[PDB]
Design the sequence.
């Protein structure tokens, strides 16, 4: 087991990637705290794997704070954190309402800052550790996603800065950049659009949440002890070359 | 002249870089609209160049909106925009108050969004054009600047996305990433030491990069990050 | 005139991009030396502009050396160099003969080293200056171009190292990365190819040699005096979305 | 075990990073073929782990070819390859002799092309697989290393091209970019350099070959099944800000 007795907290743990990550980490022997917005599915997901459920709204500074206090009270320490909690509000920029722009930045960018800052305080000067922040292949720009791309590009920048500041404290910070992963949130994607995303993917298929989880496992485990400030794309090569269409 | 009759609006036009850009563009024959927060220094910088002063708080949606209306009413068209307006609130993350984090994002990232969105609105399907957003070499991460780096990194992401959505309309979107520009003591030596060209940059030099990006000489260039940092970023993984 | 009386040497000056650059640089007041492999078309292109023709095989160490001695004898100094000489030998890697791989590397990568080295020797410790090497948007990887991509990616790496070593000598080194430029080796490219590239280009058109020439003018003139070690893409946004390198 | 029954070939397996990878991959249950230039230390490193030694000069087309024929005769299939074999010839460009420039490219850049080409040929249309080529953080430019920087940057471009071409065949191609790794080569490096290297490393120390080995394990195993065309830096953050 790669996370034997490691205390890890995971956000957005109730669905898709967060869920698959919670399961993989549990099999790897981690002492977990599952966080998400909705208590109902949070408890179900957490119980199915033996983790401790803690409702958290990564968008609410107070919520993130209370959550980490509970997690620390329950775990006693923090060895790593994988942050997922993210949303989208697609629209070409000229039809994008300010409210939609500010909501995704608040949730994805500031939310990552709040969770990361909390993760840092729980570890800095206490023990070495590893923080994994999730951005997206889209941070490089993508049609109809100026807000998503800006917020996730911001997360990459945050990661590199945090990595610079925490390095001497044995704390690593890296960011995942998944591509088109099949989850409940992508079920709505139209078939003519799916055919198009897959065509721009050298590996010719959609990704599976377990695959993102493994990337997370690697970054959080001691096997990546000499890797920090990095952006790991898990998009099947979707970003090697630019996607037309 | 490279901006002969071109209608250009410039933000942060009262300060160093913006001011230097107003002067250059004026010499290049542009019909300018100067924008900034403080009327006093704005009016003066605009008058010395023959530009039309328009007070603007890029952090305020309504101000940006009224601003562009005045610019359009005065120019009749918009051919390019160079957005500078930016701020910092340094601190190691563990000492960085949320308020500080949200202010720089609001002013730097959301401000760039409001300005670019208005610029686009004035040009899309009307005429080709060029938009230049100013980021910073720090978007690659820098000690004590999590908020600044994240916001500028967002600007780079915004510019790329904008470049993709506007390309078919003949509108180019590019981003300037200045390094260490003149107007501090031991902070200077370390900076210059990490600079291959061995010196601080001058606002004029950043203005020239803006001139290039906005003129028709960069007509086939869009979605790019142009570092004007004296090579301070060579050797660092690009983002 | 941004190149008033500046001594400039251009390789591949007889071909599309180089020719347009000779013409623009001539208008900008530069004292030019035009280099290329075939004497006939070189003399024609040089004369049409008032440049001094010097036949050169950028792949031959001695040819490059002789060429630069002529250049210096005629110019007396070197203010800048713009290098364009390059070749392609497409094929999926499994059908690529070693010979084709070694040729494009020798010409494109080693050829840039030879020219950059000569240019540097002519300026280092004598006067500040600007050197512009031409890579390609394809350095980021492209179907059927393992050799071209590898060689052009090497040029970017070469540029970056050279900018670090020459920085203190007031000598700047930058790379141009042109996209689909309408010249002659493209005039009759099969219509489905021309269509492919344009669909992947946000500005929706092929680039013109003159446009690459202006980027060269910018980088070489005193207007980019504080810019070095950079990769300037001139591909109409065709690379937007691809993970940077 | 992460590489159970996986048939893998590793170059430069006799020393440092390659040897560490060989050892790790053996514990992970891989059926290995160790390749390196010197038979003496090659057989030793391979025998100590149960790998099959095959002498190979990555700079020689025929040598690489015979090597893979032996590897295949012994393995019967190829599931992955980790290429390390590289060299340096430092010097500021004005003092860098052509021969030194051509040797590092031939060995590092062409060498990788030869090994990746043989690896691809053994897998394309036969089975999905993973190819890991080793570049270096220096691919981004470094004082006194024009030739090394260019060769490694070329490997990054090669990796990306290969990834695009082999994706449809279920074959992934990724590249490692190690930083300052504590080896029996960096030991002699003058303290001037050491202090300068460690100082520019957020993690404040040199890397160990095992750490680079783990990165290779990840990229070669099915754990990175949806990752291709990537450059994974294993430099302790040295490349974050230069």
Sequence:
């Amino acid at each position: 087991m790669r996370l034997k007795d490691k205390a890890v907290l995971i956000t957005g743990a109730a669905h898709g990637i967060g869920r698959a990550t919670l399961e993989l980490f549990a099999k790897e022997g981690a002492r977990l705290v599952a966080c998400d917005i909705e208590e109902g599915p949070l408890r179900e997901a957490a119980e199915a794997v033996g983790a401790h459920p803690v409702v958290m709204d990564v968008a609410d500074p107070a919520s993130v704070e209370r959550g980490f206090a509970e997690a620390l009270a329950h775990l006693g320490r923090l060895d790593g954190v994988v942050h997922y909690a993210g949303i989208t509000r697609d629209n070409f920029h000229w039809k994008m309402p300010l409210e939609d722009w500010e909501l995704v930045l608040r949730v994805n960018l500031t939310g990552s800052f709040l969770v990361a800052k909390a993760a840092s305080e729980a570890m800095r000067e206490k023990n070495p550790g590893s923080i994994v922040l999730t951005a997206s292949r889209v941070y490089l720009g993508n049609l109809g996603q100026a807000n998503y791309a800006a917020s996730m590009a911001g997360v990459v920048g945050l990661t590199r800065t945090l990595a610079l500041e925490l390095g001497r404290w044995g704390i690593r910070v890296n960011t995942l950049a998944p591509g088109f992963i099949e989850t409940r949130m992508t079920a709505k994607v139209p078939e003519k659009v799916r055919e198009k995303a897959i065509a721009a993917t050298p590996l010719g298929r959609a990704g599976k949440p377990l695959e993102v989880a493994y990337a997370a496992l690697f970054l959080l485990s001691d096997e990546s002890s000499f890797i920090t400030g990095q952006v790991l794309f898990v998009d099947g090569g979707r970003t090697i070359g630019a996607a037309p269409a």
Observations:
- The first helix of chain B runs from residue 16 to 27.
- The helical segments of chain B are 16-27, 39-47, 61-75, 98-123, 146-166, 186-193, 203-214.
- Residues 154 and 165 of chain B are 17 Å apart (CA to CA).
